[PDB]
């Protein structure tokens, strides 16, 4: 009933589909080699399937689905650890996915390749971010932004800066902060201070 499942999946409803307007459809199912929804890469509509996944600890595994463990969904996948050496992991795909469709072999090798490449990229980003010491913090919330915009207008009114500067300037003229014969004021106005 592998084809009958596909006809229901393709043309009625699939909970993993994401239909975009850009001329391609995407599968959200985590056990798919490519993100695209087509007949070759739908794991539900292919009884025999393979997928390469990466663990949180950093290990890359290869997953195998057979027609025999189909009615048992808890035992769908055989999990095989892939080598850290890139060549031995590519070979380990070839021996384990032997006598599979060549689409599955070719896309599992691509999925292995992109996972190793992202991991190297992940370590280069983390090294540069540690050296740069810069993090992206969220900007101000719109409630807080409206709060200090409101209180800045009230503080600018309360500050009365030009009168505050004028009062402080003439205060330092009185106490003699500029000394005898000040360079800030003309002589006949310094005489008016005394």
């Amino acid at each position: 009933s592998d084809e009958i499942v596909w006809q229901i999946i393709n043309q009625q409803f699939c909970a993993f589909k994401l239909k975009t307007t850009k001329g391609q459809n995407f599968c959200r199912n985590e056990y798919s080699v490519s993100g695209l929804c087509n007949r070759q890469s739908c794991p539900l509509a292919n009884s025999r399937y393979a997928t390469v996944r990466q663990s949180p600890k950093g290990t890359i595994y290869l997953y195998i689905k057979t027609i025999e463990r189909s009615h048992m969904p808890s035992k769908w996948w055989e999990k095989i650890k892939l080598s850290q050496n890139y060549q031995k992991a590519l070979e380990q795909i070839d021996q384990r996915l032997q006598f599979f469709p060549k689409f599955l072999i070719h896309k599992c090798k691509q999925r292995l390749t992109r996972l190793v490449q992202v991991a190297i990229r992940m370590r280069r980003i983390a090294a540069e971010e540690a050296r740069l010491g810069e993090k992206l913090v969220p900007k101000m919330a719109p409630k807080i932004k409206k709060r200090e915009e409101a209180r800045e207008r009230k503080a600018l009114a309360a500050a009365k800066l030009e009168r505050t500067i004028e009062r402080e300037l003439l205060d330092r003229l009185r106490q003699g902060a500029y000394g005898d014969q000040p360079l800030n004021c003309n002589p006949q106005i310094w005489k008016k201070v005394l």
Partner: protein
């Protein structure tokens, strides 16, 4: 109010569609394609004993 709200369906067609819905429940990937979190059950019909 005299719009036709209820429609008459043949009992033969109703029993056909129920038997098709029964058979789709025994098909494993159709369960996870409907939206069910079927990743832990050890069999897709999944009979429990009556004593429990």
């Amino acid at each position: 109010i005299w719009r036709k709200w209820h429609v008459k369906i043949n009992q033969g067609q109703k029993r056909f569609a129920t038997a098709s819905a029964l058979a789709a429940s025994a098909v494993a990937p159709l369960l996870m394609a409907r939206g069910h979190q079927v990743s832990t059950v050890p069999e897709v019909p999944l009979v429990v004993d009556s004593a429990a």
